Amino acid sequence: HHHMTTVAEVMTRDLATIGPSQSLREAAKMMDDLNVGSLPVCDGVNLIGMLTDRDIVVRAVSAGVAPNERIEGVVSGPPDWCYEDDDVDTVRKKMEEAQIRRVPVVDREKRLVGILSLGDL
Amino acid sequence: HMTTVAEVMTRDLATIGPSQSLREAAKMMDDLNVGSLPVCDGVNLIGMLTDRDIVVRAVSAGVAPNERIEGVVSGPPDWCYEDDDVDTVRKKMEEAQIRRVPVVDREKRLVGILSL
Ligand SMILES: [Cl-]
Ligand SMILES: [Cl-]
């Protein structure tokens, strides 16, 4: 048995992201269509944060921020994130510590390369 | 000895009615640190409105925060009686990935909320 499993071996590489200038309505539609509760917010491979369904509710809806408004005013971080060569068990423990279900994965240049979800484990 | 739902549920009820706004629901979820709220019209338990429901049924449709929540909730809700076995109910909650279940008496009146 050669090695402990790395994030790269279990993450998804089919990346669905949303930009900071897109609307809360667009984020909510993407969450519904993809059946996910959290989206990576990026400009291209440049990771800004993760936006959750609960973030939309407690940071936007509760404050009267309407669906046409841009995501970027609602994003708050710093995001959890990991490197693709990190050990998956260590990352899983950090996800449970933050009570998150998806974590973005970057390469050594901090470019977004994947998403690790609890369901991948 | 079997622990019943009544022994561990919260009896302090904070519910929302169908005529109240999405903003009010979201603010209650934040203030109470919960992901779902019982929707009640008087003694009539209609369903459990989740934070995700607000997003995928209201925000995704462009609904403004001041709009009422009526019709956003979908069901039927999971629910249990106060004298049900809590271990059984929690097994069902784990299976369905729900974190809160409304608890009713034999007349189907809301008496508590079970969390975990
Ligand atoms: Cl989901
Ligand atoms: Cl929560």
Distance from CA of A36 to the nearest CA of B (A): 10
Q: How many CB pairs under 8 A join A and B?
A: 69
Query: Is residue A74 in some structural domain?
Result: yes
List of chain B residues whose C-beta atoms are within 8 Å of the C-beta of residue A28: 55-56, 59-60
- What is the span of the domain harbouring residue B111? 5-115
Domain-located, residue A32: yes
Residue B81, helix vs strand vs coil: strand
**DSSP strand pairing (B100-104 vs B80-81):** parallel
Tokens found for residue A74: 């609602």
Dist. CA B23–CA B37, nearest whole Å = 13
CA–CA separation, A105 and A9 (whole Å)? 12
Is residue A1 assigned to a domain? no
Asked if A68's CB is within 8 angstroms of B59's CB, the reply is no
Positions of E strands within B1-116: 36-41, 44-50, 80-81, 100-104, 110-115
Kindly report the CATH number assigned to the domain that includes residue B13.
3.10.580.10
Nearest alpha carbon to residue A56 among B55, B88, B57, B8:
B55
Domain count, chain B: 1
Biggest alpha carbon–alpha carbon distance for chain A: 54
B19 phi, psi to nearest 5 deg: -85, -10
Contact B59, A67 (CB under 8 A): yes
CA Rg value for chain B: 14
The b-or-e profile of B28-62 (16+ CB within 10 A means b, else e) is: bbbeeebbbbbbbeeeebbbbbbbbbbbbbbbbee
Q: What angle do CA B72, A54, A100 make, to 5 degrees?
A: 135
Per the domain annotation, does A96 fall within a domain? yes
DSSP string, chain A: ---PPBGGGTSB-S---B-TTSBHHHHHHHHHHHT-SEEEEEETTEEEEEEEHHHIIIIIGGGT--TTSBGGGT--SPPP-EETTSBHHHHHHHHHHHT-SEEEEE-TT-BEEEEEEGGG-
Nearest ligand to residue B100 Cα = 2
- For A71-108, b/e burial (b = at least 16 CB within 10 A) is beebbeeebbbbebebebeebbeebeeeebebbbbbee
| CB within 8 Å: A28 and B60 | yes
φ, ψ dihedrals at A27, nearest 5°: -60, -45
How many CB atoms are closer than 10 A to CB B86? Answer: 20
Ligand 1 centroid, distance to B52 Cα (angstroms):
8
For residue A79, the CA-to-ligand 2 centroid distance in Å is: 18
Q: Which residue of B has its CA nearest to A24?
A: B59
**CA separation for the pair B35, B16 (Å, rounded):** 13
What residues does B38 pair with on adjacent strands? B48
Q: Is B35 on the interface with A (CB under 8 A)?
A: yes
Distances (CA, A) of A112 to A4, A5, A17: 22, 20, 10
Experimental method of this PDB entry: X-ray
Which residues of chain B does A76 touch, with a Cβ-Cβ cutoff of 8 Å? none
**Within a domain: A2:** no
CA gap B114, B93 in Å, rounded: 10
